[PDB]
Symmetry: D2
Subunit: 282 residues, 4 copies
């Protein structure tokens, strides 16, 4: 299991050709699971789910998809509401790979996409595992934009190493996790012209008239599958209070909260997260 | 594994002799775990943890203790703040059985006792698993007394079958769980003179000057072990909002919430609860 | 100011003739305000706003409207989603009386109607004052149905004096407010054949396909006027946690909470409520 | 009413002589009220309560006290838990001026001091008005330190104009309120050697063994007077979720929340705040 051995590309149709990069592992396992990574301008499937893919691959057929604008998937200069955009791409991939109904694992931005997908193509989404998910969260107490959102916005405005480091440091409870080699690695990816284009496209999409598609806390009462919401108690991007509406309105919801854990649950509580997910997904 | 095969008695000292009834199972397993049952006038270890003891016994050395006033333990006509009272009894049992530091599983009233014990004898309590625990909960939004508390109070005032049934029905999300044979069984136990005495003793203890000992939400910031808070989203006795202070202030806290689950988590989500507990306790 | 001196009738069109009863006071005052009373089968404008109408009339032109199914307004044997139904009736009254844009004061059920109206006829609703409002509230922590809702349902099933008293007692923090003469008065009104018909119509309307119209917490982000949410900390019908979504999503929201106050804010904190409303409404 | 006309000094005893600066107005009014300003290294009574003192002086005898470490009061290089320290100073002033029981108005840091005082000298504190108060607040959902706390800490570490501006901008919902002349004014005050000393003393006091004195959310259940908690919905220093424990546990609590209002309630909602306070204080 290396980046290269698991790398795959697909071309799907979303208002024309869109190249999607993904990682495939655990081929031969019966149950397929799709993983959808978090935000942050230099983020991608492989780095996001580094402490997870190999473990999950022992039990599942794992497809970890780079979301349009990220990793090695296409980075268009414009799109509509992002989650609906990425969900359209995912549907294309489902159809192309012949997937029927499949559980989705999504963090942050990727949680919003898993939810958008599960709402837009209800028959295609099985059980959901969502870690500090965007979109379905609404921060009832935390003033928006939150500190995590503001720090990401600052980088988008001024893409400096310093701004990326300040952003990364609010992703985690244990800030020692934010090493110089981590910062340098993400910055190199984050600061490419193509990443800058994606960041620009994202910012512009917020001002779209299809913004309601992002307010998924209004819709999740319609979800019929079990949904495991997982949060870091110390999430500074999508804070804990953002879990409440989804917890209340999703009939088969569960919530697990980890103390001493920031926004990156899959990293900071990787073992606990792994086992929770394996058990939940059968 | 039957009531009789696992039944044990111990005499401990709490201002004089106090007989404690408990159940022992999984002898030969290395890790001891103590289970502390919930409230409700006819409740006891064996019925409370019916869907749990055998499963947990496969992995642990289980000691499920009838709390003073319940089951086959002594039912004194008076005592001080209940959780501190039961914690004193438990300490006596720990010493007598030669237990050192041991994880505690407690629901409702028994969760309050596990917490009181863990605060009063800090070296003796290991990891805690607490299901809709009293004492450390403070219902920030729900007006007190809650519906569950009021229904229990009504029975204590008028110990009729009808009042017990109304009380039992707010213990669970799935009210079909409250069968006639369940009601009759609990009522027979609940309505003994000795149970009535215990109920009377309990009511009187509320008016004690040691009431602060019950306000454990003020103290749990001192707990140093991992603590897994487990709640039924639909708990009508100790509702979900009562989890917040404990979640925020216990450094190593986790919270798991089950949708479509009432106050009796160990019954309504028995399999999920069992696996969560086994994993948490190593 | 007596019931009789202020009594008025109007016939409006809601799928045919609908008679609305209301009270008019403070004629000659420049600013019109519409008051919408709470639920409870024997409730009406005059009794609901007894400690309020005369005070408010000193400053405003007050129109306190009996909502269809209540007081001396028509009690049809069937209707759609209640708030939308009552809002349709109110629109008819606005048009008929030549009202333009007017502030609305609504408690409980009447708060839901004020909100439905403000959403359906956006140009016609000015500032809103909403006391423990239904509809826009969603109880993020309290299991539904709440104790207040359950007690009302029990009466609807078994319309006995005893059941009405149990219901009334969860309307207030100070239960001494629930006197025998109050109970008898409400029961006489509550137990008429026509009230029973309205109760029956209401129960049936819940099962309608237009239920979304009642989930107003999904829509209030669209409200553009100042909105003063007022709650009794001890509200056992629509508890405090039900305020959160509306507080977060209404751009110009305020919230005032009274400790030692139940569901009937306008009664239990009548002076404070009166002054708050007068100030808020200019 | 100018700074100079209202300026007063007093020498009180807190482990030796401590000079307190305060402003006196509305002399001849019967009801005395004490105002306690917020934090921020260059803050003081006069600037904190600029939009308030003259208005309140029409109705009350106002004493707005510079808290030790601030304004023209003594700035010692060391002290214990700050709120208890300031409360000791205030007691000295009460005794010296012959005040008996007097209502307290406190924001932020000053709210914590009003509360500490009301707990330590229960007979001396009347009704409390507390705006986004420190100390009694505990942020059940917001990870600590909050963005406001972090920005203040950054200035304390690196006292630059830029850091002060970033801090000030999270004090308000309307960031246009943070003008260049405001920044320059606060920075000049904030960056004096004596202010730096106070900041240093404050930071050091956090590490004291008397830290429990700051955890006032544990004690406010003991307050017997009416308490009006006032919050800006968008408070980024002491966010709204920090109001809950105090709201629940203070028997005679009220809460008022203003949407579109940050941490500086007394500035951003000055008129509404003024009227609320005047009414509450009789």
């Amino acid at each position: 299991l290396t980046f290269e051995s698991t790398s795959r590309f697909a071309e799907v149709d979303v208002d024309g050709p869109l190249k999607l990069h993904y990682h495939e592992a655990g081929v031969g396992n019966d149950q397929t699971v799709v993983l959808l990574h978090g935000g942050g301008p230099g983020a991608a499937s492989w780095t996001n789910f580094s402490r997870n893919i190999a473990v999950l691959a022992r039990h599942f057929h794992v497809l970890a998809v780079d979301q349009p604008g990220y990793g090695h998937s296409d980075k268009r200069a414009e799109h509509g509401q992002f989650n609906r955009y990425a969900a359209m791409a995912l549907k294309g991939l489902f159809d192309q790979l012949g997937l029927g109904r499949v559980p989705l694992v999504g963090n942050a931005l990727g949680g919003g996409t898993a939810v958008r997908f599960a709402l837009d193509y209800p028959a295609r989404a099985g059980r959901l595992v969502l870690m500090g998910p965007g979109g379905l969260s609404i921060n009832l107490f935390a003033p928006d934009p939150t500190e995590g959102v503001k720090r990401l916005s600052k980088f988008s405005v001024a893409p400096t190493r310093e701004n990326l480091e300040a952003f990364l440091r609010v992703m985690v409870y244990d800030k020692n996790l934010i090493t110089p080699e981590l910062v340098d690695q993400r910055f190199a990816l984050a600061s490419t012209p193509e990443s800058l284009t994606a960041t620009r496209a994202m910012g512009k999409s917020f001002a779209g008239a299809d913004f309601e598609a992002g307010m998924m806390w209004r819709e999740v009462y319609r979800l019929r599958q079990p949904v495991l919401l997982i949060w870091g108690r110390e999430d500074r991007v999508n804070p804990l209070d953002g879990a409440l509406v989804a917890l209340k309105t999703i009939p088969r919801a569960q919530l697990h909260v980890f103390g001493q854990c920031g926004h990156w649950v899959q990293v900071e509580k990787f073992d606990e997260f792994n086992k929770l997910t394996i058990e939940f997904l059968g």
